[model samples]
Target chain A: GSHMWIGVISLFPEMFKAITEFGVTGRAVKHNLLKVECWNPRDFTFDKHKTVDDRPYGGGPGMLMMVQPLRDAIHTAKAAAGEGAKVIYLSPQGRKLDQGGVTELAQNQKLILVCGRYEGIDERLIQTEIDEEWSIGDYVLTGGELPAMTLIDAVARFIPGVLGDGLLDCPHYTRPEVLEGLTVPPVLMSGHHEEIRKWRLKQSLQRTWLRRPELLEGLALTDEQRKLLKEAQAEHN
Target chain B: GSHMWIGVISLFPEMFKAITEFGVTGRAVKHNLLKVECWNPRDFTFDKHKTVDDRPYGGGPGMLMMVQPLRDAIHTAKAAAGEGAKVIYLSPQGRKLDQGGVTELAQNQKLILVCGRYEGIDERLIQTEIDEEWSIGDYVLTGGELPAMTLIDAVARFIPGVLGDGLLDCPHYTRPEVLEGLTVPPVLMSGHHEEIRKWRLKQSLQRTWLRRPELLEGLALTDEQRKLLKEAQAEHN
Candidate 1:
């Protein structure tokens, strides 16, 4: 398939509009690079109140999204996605979503994302229906819509043409190179593409080392990369 | 003050409306527990073209948001937010946001969040105008709007009344206790509030331990919590 279909199960389908209609992700949608639809559990509810949450069996704070409606919604999306489709629930109790994870998800043919509200979904639903669980970070939100959007945005960039050349982002400069005495790095404008690429790699390596050292541990560095990192370390010190 | 003010700088200000108008975040905005506004750098620009990007100093892929307009936008937001307001840029290089971080940021009275698109803003603007940078996770999003929304949702939960009783979330259950023979835990429905609370604590501790063990290291657990966690660990094994 040229584009993956992501069926999002949410209480608020309107929440997806921003990502669907605006920005880079929006542009990708317009180009038919991907397709996303929302499945509202409310639409699957039976009660007059359209209730989807209730008190916990082992009571705590907040309501839990009832199992039935969510399960039904998931089934609907899954059937539409056909065989081999994955149902992923966003929760605090999941593997961290990172660049590698996003890249992996972008390769899937279909994804059914369940965004939980209230406290969480019933454990029964998770064990029975969800194929995987992913969390954008350690912080908890009132709902999972934002994490779903974050995953979509990051994952979409990995699809060919969603980003230019699929290269790690390098520094960008435009006109007016001089801004308040801090000029665009002189090397970028010196007409030396090799030096520019090298300078960018060094900056990326240094930025990761300084802010997110764990990321550097996963990367297999070339001799040039190792040398550049050493120089970056010396300059920072 | 009962509410904190959040000012956002973005080229696409309409992107924020989803957060402002939907679900729990929507309720928060309507209830005035917090105030938020967006400032577009495009509106702050001088030229007829209103161009806001330039080529990178160490050019690679993508354009960088220009320094002058973004700097001006930050200043405008800062002036409106009054002194002591912090300007935060959303970047991959920023600190990873976690619950602890969210709790801390929730204490601030005002914040100015800057979202970068294309490649990024000139480093000069970050150095001159940004007070801090924060990332939702290790993955990169083309723009910072989602991260900004995520931050608002997480931080808002810490504000009084945003979440009920300000208690940590616990599992919830409703009627129809048996879903495919997987019963709601008996302890929750025992009508014993203390045991319920204890069970909830244990679950929270164990869940955190299993999914994000690093989170448990910084905590000061009470004797009761420690015992519950031990039980939770034993049960899991």
Candidate 2:
């Protein structure tokens, strides 16, 4: 499939417009490389108050999302996304998402993301309804909307043509040869194409090594890159 | 202080309205528990073109955010937030943010957050102007706008009255005792207050252990909690 479709089930569907209407994710949607649709849990409720949450079976400080509304919402989202879609619940009690997870999720043709609010949804709903649960990081926000947007941004970047590259970007600078008494490295300003290319490669390698050494563990570095890394290590403060 | 002030410097300040106008973060702003201001780097540019990005010093695929505009914007943000406020840059190379970091950041009375776009910013700007750098996780997005919002949401919850409580809330259930053949745990339906309280505690402990065991490592568990944890492990799948 040339396009990825994601249907999000959330109480505040408007929160999703943040991703759908702005930045790279927005451009992806506009380019038809990705499609995102929001489904509100409240729309599934039939109560006079349109109540979607209730007190926990056991007394608690915060309310729990009732099972029926969320279950119904997930089913509706699944119907639109298709039977092959994986339903994911965004919550703290899920797999911590990293770049590896983003790459994997981006390969799917369709997804149904459920955003939980309050204390959480009834445990029973999660057991039977959610295919997977993924967390953005180890923190608790007021709700799952922000995490849902985060997952979308991360996964969208992996889609073809969205970012045009997957590797960690090297540091970059622009004109005004100097700022605040710091001048651009003279080597960059030199017009020797081969030397500039090598310099860029070395900087990228050294930057990754210094900041995120774990990422380097997976890469098969070239002999030149290895030499550059050692040189960087020797010279680094 | 009853209030926390954060000034965010970004190219797309409108994206921040995502948090400032919606959900719990919005409510906090309304309650005066928090103040979030967005300053556009583009606005700080004095040139007729209002240009903020340029090609890398060395050849690169993407442009770099020019240092001058960002520096000016950050300085303006600092003046508004206060001299004591720390200046943070959101980037892939920064320290990974977690709940503990959120708790620590929330203690600050004022903060200035500089969001970078394009390939990245000049290294000299980061070395000279920034007090710290923070990353949401090990994933890449198009820009720092979403990550800035993520940080805001995560930090906003820790403001005294923002979330009301900072602990991991227990899993909860609501009306409709059963749905899709899944029934609420029987003990919850039992009105015996002491038994209900005990069951909730066990569920909370067991849930955290099963989902995020790392969190428990830092806590001092009660004798009762230790006994409950063992019982949970014995019964868990």
Candidate 3:
């Protein structure tokens, strides 16, 4: 299969270099597993000022992204992306993003992401051009560029070669066996494979249950997991 | 009166420049409303290679961020940030981040954030050093740099002067009163001040109810908002 292609429509295209130049997503790009291209709305503007925003129709404290250049940039990215390319707009109004959503989005062959600036983009552009909207969290950011870059970083980890452990993440320790009055968990260093696995599982369960119990509602735990979780709960009590 | 100070502990210090050099957060830094400083864990390493990670103790697919250097960097950042600063660790096994949480975090005058890489940081460091842990979302990235930046971007908006509209953003239209088959919502262009206010309110309510019903759960809607939401639901059906 060809590299997963992502075309981004952004006002500040340079902001994406954060993901492209370093970290895990950067490695993914270098390995030819993914490709990211940016299309600036400013570049698509027809006016001499290359204006891409204006005062909101009903009047607001901040400007709103106009329709013309944004739609043009989105179309350009779609055309360059080829067929079956879905357009995603990063905004708080969109579907809440989670690991499940990340896995689903990673399956697509191509994606065109629109990053709006100012207050938000014209409603018409969303109705006509966007396939979906995904929000990183409930909070708002100055613009969509950071969320777009974040989408790339998270989704890239699921793209074939990228990797990790599951759920709420297990504790990990390395080196020194001992450091400033704190020692590595003895079970991890015991060399008993079965015990090590068991300890890791219990830690993961306890940590998730302690920090994010809502996530546990969906999972059907094995007998051993249920038992371990109960034990962890008892210890906490 | 002075800038809100954020001290970041990361292996890849250059990545923080993405927020420090561009976007709204950038403007905050320039205006002296916020200050972002990155402290590299590698610099805190005592080894000849300045190693910051090692193979996980219980054996894992990837490396885990070791404790010593990370602890030292946290200490260094805390020392530089002065008293009353809280140390936050970005990890999956942490409290979920939301607008409410962002507002709470923004209240702190000083913050020291630690960004972990590889599998995860030594759990002992979390127990002994961190004041809190925050996950941007359920999805995992190659590292914590992006999440750290996201946290800053979100929290910065809650600072004394950063901005936006509320929940499931209202559709914004600007300029051109008319555009390629899509006209501005008539109420917006009528210049009927009261009507415009009514329309914007309806749109905000309807949009939130339609896209993020859960957000609406905590909200106490006015009589008009409830009516508008019902109207929106009817139209949606």
Give lDDT tens digits, candidate 3, residues A67-159.
778888888888888899989999988898988899899889898889888889888778888889899888888889888988888888778
Give the runs in model 3 whose Cα sits over 4 Å from its true position. Answer: A163-166, B161-166, B234-237
TM-score-wise, the better of 1 and 2 is 1
Tens digits of lDDT, candidate 1, A153-196 = 88888777677711234445565667667777788778898987
DockQ of every candidate: 0.62, 0.60, 0.70
Model 2 regions lying over 4 Å from their true place? A164-169, A191-225, B165-170, B192-194, B204-222
Cα-based lDDT at residue B11, candidate 2: 84
Question: Can you rank all candidates by TM-score, best first?
Answer: 3, 1, 2
User: Clashing pairs in model 3?
Assistant: none
Candidate 1 chain B, poorest ten consecutive residues by summed lDDT: B165-174
Highest TM-score among the candidates is held by which one?
Answer: 3
TM-score of 3: 0.95
Compare the candidates by DockQ and give the number of the best one. 3
lDDT of 2 by residue, A1-237 (tens): 367899999888877777888767888999998899988879999999998888888676788887778888888888777678998999877898988899899888888888988788887777888889898888888888888888888888878878852235565667778877888888888877888877777787887877778788888888988898788888896
Chain A TM-score relative to the true structure, per candidate: 0.91, 0.90, 0.95
